[PDB]
RNA sequence: ACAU
DNA sequence: CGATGT
């Protein structure tokens, strides 16, 4: 319907899928970059989108902020709601880092509480999410 | 089919 | 064109 401008927007960026994964969070109103994750050598788009939301939850909780989070990823929103990232990515030596970070994010969700609304960014109506990397 |  | 996901 209407954009909630008082919000945090998150997005993944990648080089290949699977490939090098990063993510960032921005103030929806102003575009100010609030956090950026150092690139992870091998991961998937959906793992990165999941980590971005969970990082947003942790960022907002530490700052006592009740703002919602926007994500464009139907998959990642569902994984966060379930507290379980149902990724198909093989677990091997090459993917150990991303899977460690995903496991740690699930662990955080299972030991902490939050009321943050996690909202779908409506790309078909509103254009690209404000945290997008501009690579498509 | 839809969402990345 | 290829991939990740519900
Ligand atoms: K998009
Ligand atoms: K992009
Ligand atoms: K498909
Ligand atoms: Mg996205
Ligand atoms: Mg994007």
Coordinates of N, CA and C (backbone and C1' of nucleotides) and ligand atoms in Angstrom, one line a residue:
Chain A
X1 N 0.8 -1.2 0.0 CA 0.0 0.0 0.0 C 0.9 1.3 0.0
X2 N 1.1 1.8 1.2 CA 2.0 3.0 1.3 C 3.3 2.5 1.9
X3 N 4.4 3.1 1.5 CA 5.7 2.8 2.0 C 5.8 3.4 3.4
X4 N 6.4 2.6 4.4 CA 6.6 3.1 5.7 C 8.1 3.6 5.7
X5 N 8.2 5.0 5.5 CA 9.5 5.5 5.3 C 10.4 5.4 6.5
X6 N 9.8 5.4 7.7 CA 10.5 5.2 9.0 C 10.8 3.7 9.2
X7 N 11.8 3.2 8.5 CA 12.1 1.8 8.4 C 13.6 1.6 8.0
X8 N 14.0 0.4 8.1 CA 15.4 -0.1 7.7 C 15.1 -1.0 6.5
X9 N 15.9 -0.8 5.4 CA 15.8 -1.7 4.3 C 17.1 -2.5 4.1
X10 N 17.0 -3.8 3.8 CA 18.2 -4.6 3.7 C 18.2 -5.3 2.3
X11 N 19.4 -5.7 1.8 CA 19.5 -6.4 0.6 C 20.9 -7.1 0.5
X12 N 20.9 -8.2 -0.2 CA 22.0 -9.0 -0.6 C 22.6 -8.4 -1.9
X13 N 23.9 -8.7 -2.0 CA 24.6 -8.5 -3.3 C 25.5 -9.7 -3.5
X14 N 25.7 -10.1 -4.8 CA 26.5 -11.3 -5.0 C 27.3 -11.1 -6.3
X15 N 28.3 -12.0 -6.4 CA 29.1 -12.2 -7.6 C 29.0 -13.7 -7.9
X16 N 28.0 -14.0 -8.7 CA 27.6 -15.4 -8.9 C 26.6 -15.8 -7.8
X17 N 25.8 -16.8 -8.2 CA 24.9 -17.4 -7.2 C 24.8 -18.9 -7.5
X18 N 25.5 -19.7 -6.7 CA 26.3 -19.3 -5.5 C 27.5 -18.6 -6.0
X19 N 28.0 -17.7 -5.1 CA 29.2 -17.0 -5.3 C 29.5 -16.1 -4.2
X20 N 30.3 -15.0 -4.4 CA 30.7 -14.1 -3.3 C 29.4 -13.3 -2.9
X21 N 29.1 -13.3 -1.6 CA 27.9 -12.7 -1.0 C 28.3 -11.6 0.0
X22 N 27.6 -10.5 -0.1 CA 27.6 -9.4 0.9 C 26.2 -8.9 1.1
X23 N 26.0 -8.1 2.1 CA 24.7 -7.5 2.3 C 24.9 -6.1 3.0
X24 N 23.8 -5.3 2.9 CA 23.9 -4.0 3.6 C 22.5 -3.6 4.0
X25 N 22.5 -2.7 5.0 CA 21.2 -2.1 5.5 C 21.3 -0.6 5.4
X26 N 20.2 0.0 5.0 CA 20.1 1.5 4.8 C 18.8 2.0 5.4
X27 N 18.9 3.3 5.8 CA 17.7 4.1 6.2 C 16.8 4.2 4.9
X28 N 15.6 3.7 5.0 CA 14.7 3.8 3.8 C 14.5 5.3 3.4
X29 N 14.4 6.2 4.3 CA 14.0 7.6 4.0 C 15.1 8.3 3.3
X30 N 16.4 8.1 3.7 CA 17.5 8.9 3.3 C 18.5 8.1 2.5
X31 N 18.5 6.8 2.5 CA 19.5 6.0 1.8 C 20.8 5.9 2.5
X32 N 21.0 6.4 3.7 CA 22.2 6.3 4.5 C 22.5 4.9 4.8
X33 N 23.7 4.5 4.5 CA 24.2 3.1 4.8 C 24.4 3.0 6.3
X34 N 23.8 2.0 6.9 CA 23.9 1.8 8.3 C 24.8 0.7 8.7
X35 N 24.8 -0.4 7.9 CA 25.8 -1.5 8.1 C 26.1 -2.1 6.8
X36 N 27.2 -2.8 6.7 CA 27.7 -3.5 5.5 C 28.5 -4.7 6.0
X37 N 28.2 -5.9 5.5 CA 28.9 -7.1 5.8 C 30.1 -7.3 4.8
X38 N 31.3 -7.6 5.3 CA 32.4 -7.9 4.5 C 32.1 -9.1 3.6
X39 N 32.5 -9.1 2.4 CA 32.1 -10.3 1.5 C 32.5 -11.6 2.0
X40 N 31.7 -12.6 1.7 CA 31.8 -14.0 2.1 C 32.1 -14.8 0.9
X41 N 33.2 -15.6 0.8 CA 33.6 -16.1 -0.5 C 32.6 -17.0 -1.3
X42 N 31.8 -17.8 -0.6 CA 30.8 -18.6 -1.3 C 29.5 -18.7 -0.4
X43 N 28.4 -18.3 -1.0 CA 27.1 -18.4 -0.4 C 26.0 -18.2 -1.5
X44 N 24.8 -18.3 -1.1 CA 23.7 -18.1 -2.0 C 23.0 -16.8 -1.7
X45 N 22.2 -16.3 -2.7 CA 21.4 -15.2 -2.6 C 20.5 -15.2 -1.4
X46 N 19.9 -16.4 -1.1 CA 18.9 -16.5 -0.1 C 19.5 -16.5 1.3
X47 N 20.7 -17.2 1.4 CA 21.4 -17.1 2.7 C 21.8 -15.7 3.0
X48 N 22.3 -14.9 2.0 CA 22.6 -13.5 2.3 C 21.5 -12.7 2.6
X49 N 20.3 -12.9 2.0 CA 19.1 -12.2 2.3 C 18.7 -12.5 3.8
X50 N 18.8 -13.7 4.2 CA 18.5 -14.1 5.5 C 19.4 -13.5 6.5
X51 N 20.7 -13.5 6.3 CA 21.7 -12.9 7.2 C 21.4 -11.4 7.3
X52 N 21.0 -10.8 6.2 CA 20.8 -9.3 6.2 C 19.6 -9.0 7.2
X53 N 18.5 -9.8 7.1 CA 17.4 -9.5 8.0 C 17.8 -9.7 9.4
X54 N 18.4 -10.8 9.7 CA 18.8 -11.1 11.1 C 19.7 -10.0 11.6
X55 N 20.7 -9.6 10.8 CA 21.6 -8.5 11.3 C 20.7 -7.3 11.5
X56 N 19.8 -7.0 10.7 CA 18.9 -5.8 10.9 C 18.2 -6.0 12.3
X57 N 17.7 -7.2 12.6 CA 17.0 -7.3 13.9 C 17.9 -7.0 15.0
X58 N 19.2 -7.5 14.9 CA 20.2 -7.3 16.0 C 20.6 -5.9 16.1
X59 N 20.7 -5.2 14.9 CA 21.1 -3.8 14.9 C 20.0 -2.9 15.6
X60 N 18.8 -3.2 15.2 CA 17.7 -2.4 15.8 C 17.5 -2.7 17.3
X61 N 17.6 -3.9 17.7 CA 17.4 -4.2 19.1 C 18.5 -3.6 19.9
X62 N 19.7 -3.6 19.5 CA 20.8 -3.0 20.2 C 20.6 -1.5 20.4
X63 N 19.9 -0.8 19.4 CA 19.6 0.6 19.5 C 18.2 0.9 20.0
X64 N 17.5 -0.1 20.6 CA 16.2 0.2 21.1 C 15.3 0.9 20.1
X65 N 15.3 0.4 18.9 CA 14.5 1.0 17.8 C 13.4 0.0 17.4
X66 N 12.2 0.5 17.3 CA 11.0 -0.3 16.9 C 10.7 -0.2 15.4
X67 N 11.5 0.4 14.6 CA 11.3 0.5 13.2 C 11.2 -0.9 12.6
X68 N 10.3 -1.0 11.5 CA 10.3 -2.3 10.8 C 11.4 -2.4 9.8
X69 N 11.6 -3.6 9.3 CA 12.6 -4.0 8.3 C 11.9 -4.3 7.0
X70 N 12.3 -3.8 5.9 CA 11.9 -4.2 4.6 C 13.0 -5.1 4.0
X71 N 12.5 -6.2 3.3 CA 13.3 -7.1 2.5 C 12.4 -7.4 1.2
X72 N 13.1 -7.6 0.1 CA 12.4 -8.0 -1.1 C 12.3 -9.5 -1.3
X73 N 12.8 -10.3 -0.3 CA 13.0 -11.7 -0.4 C 11.9 -12.5 0.3
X74 N 10.9 -13.0 -0.5 CA 9.9 -13.8 0.1 C 10.5 -15.0 0.9
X75 N 11.6 -15.6 0.3 CA 12.2 -16.7 0.9 C 12.8 -16.3 2.3
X76 N 13.6 -15.3 2.3 CA 14.3 -14.9 3.6 C 13.3 -14.5 4.7
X77 N 12.2 -13.8 4.3 CA 11.2 -13.4 5.3 C 10.6 -14.7 5.9
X78 N 10.3 -15.7 5.1 CA 9.8 -16.9 5.6 C 10.8 -17.7 6.5
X79 N 12.0 -17.7 6.1 CA 13.1 -18.4 6.9 C 13.2 -17.7 8.3
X80 N 13.2 -16.4 8.3 CA 13.3 -15.7 9.6 C 12.0 -16.0 10.5
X81 N 10.8 -16.0 9.9 CA 9.6 -16.3 10.6 C 9.7 -17.7 11.2
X82 N 10.2 -18.7 10.4 CA 10.4 -20.1 10.9 C 11.6 -20.3 11.8
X83 N 12.5 -19.3 11.9 CA 13.8 -19.4 12.5 C 14.6 -20.6 12.0
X84 N 14.5 -20.8 10.7 CA 15.2 -21.9 10.0 C 15.5 -21.6 8.6
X85 N 16.7 -21.6 8.2 CA 17.1 -21.3 6.8 C 17.3 -22.6 6.0
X86 N 16.3 -22.9 5.2 CA 16.2 -24.1 4.5 C 16.9 -24.1 3.2
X87 N 18.2 -23.8 3.3 CA 19.1 -23.7 2.1 C 19.5 -25.1 1.6
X88 N 19.6 -25.2 0.2 CA 20.1 -26.4 -0.5 C 21.6 -26.4 -0.6
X89 N 22.3 -25.3 -0.2 CA 23.7 -25.2 -0.5 C 24.5 -26.4 0.2
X90 N 25.3 -27.1 -0.5 CA 26.1 -28.1 0.1 C 26.9 -27.5 1.3
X91 N 27.0 -28.3 2.3 CA 27.9 -28.0 3.4 C 29.2 -28.8 3.2
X92 N 30.3 -28.0 2.8 CA 31.6 -28.6 2.7 C 32.6 -27.5 3.2
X93 N 33.9 -27.8 2.9 CA 35.0 -26.9 3.4 C 34.8 -25.5 2.8
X94 N 34.4 -25.5 1.5 CA 34.2 -24.2 0.7 C 33.1 -23.4 1.3
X95 N 32.0 -24.0 1.8 CA 30.9 -23.2 2.2 C 30.8 -23.1 3.7
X96 N 31.9 -23.5 4.4 CA 31.9 -23.5 5.9 C 31.6 -22.2 6.5
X97 N 32.1 -21.1 5.9 CA 31.9 -19.8 6.5 C 30.5 -19.3 6.5
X98 N 29.9 -19.4 5.3 CA 28.5 -18.9 5.2 C 27.6 -19.8 6.1
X99 N 27.8 -21.1 6.1 CA 27.0 -21.9 6.9 C 27.2 -21.7 8.4
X100 N 28.4 -21.3 8.8 CA 28.7 -20.9 10.2 C 27.8 -19.7 10.6
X101 N 27.8 -18.7 9.7 CA 27.1 -17.4 9.9 C 25.6 -17.7 9.9
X102 N 25.1 -18.6 9.0 CA 23.7 -18.9 9.0 C 23.3 -19.6 10.3
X103 N 24.1 -20.6 10.7 CA 23.9 -21.3 12.0 C 23.8 -20.4 13.2
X104 N 24.8 -19.4 13.2 CA 24.8 -18.4 14.3 C 23.6 -17.5 14.3
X105 N 23.1 -17.1 13.1 CA 21.9 -16.3 13.0 C 20.7 -17.1 13.5
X106 N 20.6 -18.3 13.1 CA 19.5 -19.1 13.7 C 19.6 -19.2 15.2
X107 N 20.8 -19.4 15.7 CA 21.0 -19.5 17.1 C 20.6 -18.3 17.8
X108 N 20.9 -17.1 17.2 CA 20.5 -15.8 17.8 C 19.0 -15.8 17.9
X109 N 18.3 -16.1 16.7 CA 16.8 -16.0 16.7 C 16.2 -16.9 17.8
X110 N 16.8 -18.0 18.1 CA 16.3 -19.0 19.1 C 16.5 -18.6 20.5
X111 N 17.3 -17.6 20.8 CA 17.7 -17.2 22.1 C 17.3 -15.7 22.4
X112 N 16.7 -15.0 21.5 CA 16.3 -13.6 21.7 C 14.9 -13.3 21.2
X113 N 14.4 -12.2 21.7 CA 13.0 -11.8 21.3 C 13.1 -10.5 20.6
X114 N 12.0 -10.2 19.8 CA 11.9 -9.0 19.1 C 10.5 -8.8 18.6
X115 N 10.1 -7.6 18.4 CA 8.8 -7.3 17.9 C 8.8 -6.7 16.5
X116 N 10.0 -6.5 16.0 CA 10.2 -5.8 14.7 C 9.4 -6.4 13.6
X117 N 8.5 -5.7 13.0 CA 7.8 -6.2 11.8 C 8.8 -6.3 10.7
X118 N 8.7 -7.5 10.0 CA 9.5 -7.8 8.8 C 8.5 -7.8 7.6
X119 N 8.7 -6.7 6.8 CA 7.7 -6.4 5.7 C 8.3 -6.6 4.4
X120 N 7.4 -7.0 3.4 CA 7.8 -7.3 2.1 C 7.9 -5.9 1.3
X121 N 9.1 -5.6 0.8 CA 9.2 -4.5 -0.1 C 8.6 -4.8 -1.5
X122 N 7.6 -4.0 -1.9 CA 6.8 -4.3 -3.1 C 7.4 -3.8 -4.4
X123 N 8.4 -4.5 -4.8 CA 9.2 -4.1 -6.0 C 8.4 -3.8 -7.2
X124 N 7.3 -4.5 -7.5 CA 6.6 -4.3 -8.7 C 5.9 -3.0 -8.7
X125 N 5.6 -2.4 -7.5 CA 4.9 -1.1 -7.3 C 5.9 0.0 -7.1
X126 N 7.0 -0.3 -6.3 CA 7.8 0.8 -5.8 C 9.2 0.9 -6.4
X127 N 9.6 0.0 -7.3 CA 10.9 0.0 -7.8 C 11.8 -0.8 -6.8
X128 N 13.1 -0.8 -7.1 CA 14.1 -1.5 -6.4 C 14.2 -1.0 -5.0
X129 N 14.4 -2.0 -4.0 CA 14.6 -1.6 -2.6 C 15.8 -0.7 -2.5
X130 N 15.8 0.2 -1.5 CA 16.8 1.2 -1.4 C 18.2 0.7 -1.0
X131 N 18.3 -0.5 -0.5 CA 19.5 -1.1 -0.2 C 20.1 -1.9 -1.4
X132 N 19.5 -1.9 -2.6 CA 19.9 -2.7 -3.7 C 21.3 -2.3 -4.1
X133 N 22.1 -3.2 -4.7 CA 23.4 -3.0 -5.2 C 23.6 -2.4 -6.6
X134 N 22.5 -2.3 -7.3 CA 22.6 -1.8 -8.7 C 23.3 -2.7 -9.7
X135 N 23.4 -4.0 -9.5 CA 24.1 -4.9 -10.3 C 23.3 -5.6 -11.4
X136 N 21.9 -5.4 -11.3 CA 21.1 -6.1 -12.3 C 20.7 -5.3 -13.5
Chain B
rA1 O5' 3.9 -18.8 -14.8 C5' 2.6 -18.8 -14.3 C4' 2.5 -18.4 -12.9 C3' 3.4 -17.4 -12.4 O3' 2.9 -16.1 -12.6 C1' 3.4 -19.2 -10.9
rC2 P 3.9 -14.8 -12.6 O5' 4.3 -14.7 -11.0 C5' 3.4 -14.4 -10.0 C4' 4.0 -14.6 -8.7 C3' 5.3 -13.9 -8.4 O3' 5.2 -12.5 -8.1 C1' 5.6 -16.1 -7.7
rA3 P 6.3 -11.4 -8.3 O5' 7.4 -11.8 -7.2 C5' 7.0 -11.6 -5.8 C4' 8.2 -12.1 -5.0 C3' 9.5 -11.5 -5.4 O3' 9.7 -10.2 -5.0 C1' 9.7 -13.8 -4.9
rU4 P 10.9 -9.3 -5.7 O5' 12.1 -10.3 -5.7 C5' 13.4 -10.0 -5.2 C4' 14.0 -11.3 -4.6 C3' 15.5 -11.3 -4.3 O3' 15.8 -12.0 -3.1 C1' 14.9 -13.1 -5.7
Chain C
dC1 O5' 18.1 -18.8 -21.9 C5' 19.2 -19.4 -22.6 C4' 20.5 -19.2 -21.9 C3' 20.5 -19.8 -20.5 O3' 20.9 -21.1 -20.5 C1' 21.3 -17.5 -20.4
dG2 P 20.4 -22.2 -19.4 O5' 21.2 -21.8 -18.1 C5' 22.6 -22.0 -18.0 C4' 23.0 -21.4 -16.7 C3' 22.3 -21.8 -15.4 O3' 22.8 -23.0 -14.9 C1' 22.6 -19.5 -15.4
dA3 P 22.1 -23.8 -13.8 O5' 22.0 -22.9 -12.5 C5' 23.1 -22.8 -11.6 C4' 22.8 -21.7 -10.5 C3' 21.7 -22.2 -9.5 O3' 22.4 -22.8 -8.4 C1' 21.3 -19.9 -10.2
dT4 P 21.6 -23.5 -7.2 O5' 20.8 -22.3 -6.5 C5' 21.5 -21.3 -5.8 C4' 20.5 -20.6 -5.0 C3' 19.6 -21.4 -4.0 O3' 19.7 -20.8 -2.8 C1' 18.3 -19.9 -5.3
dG5 P 19.2 -21.6 -1.4 O5' 17.7 -21.2 -1.3 C5' 16.6 -22.2 -1.3 C4' 15.3 -21.4 -1.5 C3' 14.0 -22.1 -1.3 O3' 13.6 -22.1 0.1 C1' 14.0 -20.5 -3.1
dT6 P 12.4 -22.9 0.6 O5' 11.1 -22.1 0.1 C5' 10.7 -20.9 0.7 C4' 9.3 -20.6 0.3 C3' 8.2 -21.7 0.7 O3' 7.1 -21.1 1.2 C1' 8.1 -21.1 -1.6
Ligands
LIG1 K1 14.9 -7.1 -6.8
LIG2 K1 21.3 -5.4 -8.0
LIG3 K1 12.4 -21.9 -10.6
LIG4 MG1 17.0 -8.6 -2.6
LIG5 MG1 18.9 -6.3 -4.9

